[PDB]
Design a protein around this ligand. Structure first.
Ligand SMILES: Cn1nc(C(=O)NCCn2cncn2)c2ccccc21
Ligand SMILES: Cn1nc(C(=O)NCCn2cncn2)c2ccccc21
Ligand SMILES: [Zn+2]
Length: 139
């Protein structure tokens, strides 16, 4: 689990969004596994505006923050899960690292701020849904 709070927005994995998120929907994209909903309170997270390829992510299944190198956002084939059939996921970044399904929502950060959230993984890889291209999250 996990979410990003910036301005009056909440950014979550689309597969983990709640009924309140869908009723208060701002934008979602199934191919990215992202959903953004509106909030009443101001959030404290800052989104990175950069092309960093090194950062640190939170892995709940190890209670640890791991430093990693990751690929730039790309279109990647992802196998089926209980939430989606096998498909191409867009804006996805991969790193070598541990992850399990319930690690989705863990944040990836670089020196500039929040980069993305855990969305895919297995077999020694972890995949993050990028949010840096969503410039409207800051305005
Ligand atoms: C479109 N929609 N989907 C859900 C949902 O819970 N789906 C299972 C989780 N999921 C997997 N992938 C995407 N979501 C939902 C709930 C309330 C209103 C609208 C909704
Ligand atoms: C981090 N992580 N996430 C998943 C997962 O099932 N994600 C559900 C959302 N999803 C995205 N594309 C398809 N389904 C996973 C599985 C095994 C090991 C690690 C994992
Ligand atoms: Zn950066």
């Amino acid at each position: 689990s996990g979410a990003i709070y910036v301005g009056n927005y909440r950014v979550v994995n689309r597969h983990l969004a709640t009924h309140n998120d869908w009723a208060n929907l701002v934008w979602e994209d199934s191919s990215r596994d992202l959903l953004v909903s509106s909030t009443t309170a101001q959030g404290c997270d800052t989104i990175a505006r950069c092309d960093c390829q090194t950062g640190v992510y939170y892995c709940s299944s190890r209670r640890k923050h791991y430093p990693v190198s990751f690929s730039k956002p790309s279109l990647i084939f992802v196998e089926a899960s209980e939430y989606y059939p096998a498909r191409y996921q867009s804006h996805l970044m991969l790193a070598v690292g541990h992850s399990e399904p319930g690690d989705c929502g863990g944040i990836l950060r670089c020196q500039h701020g929040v980069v993305g959230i855990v969305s895919t993984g297995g077999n020694g890889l972890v995949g993050f849904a990028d949010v840096r291209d969503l410039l409207w999250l800051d305005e």
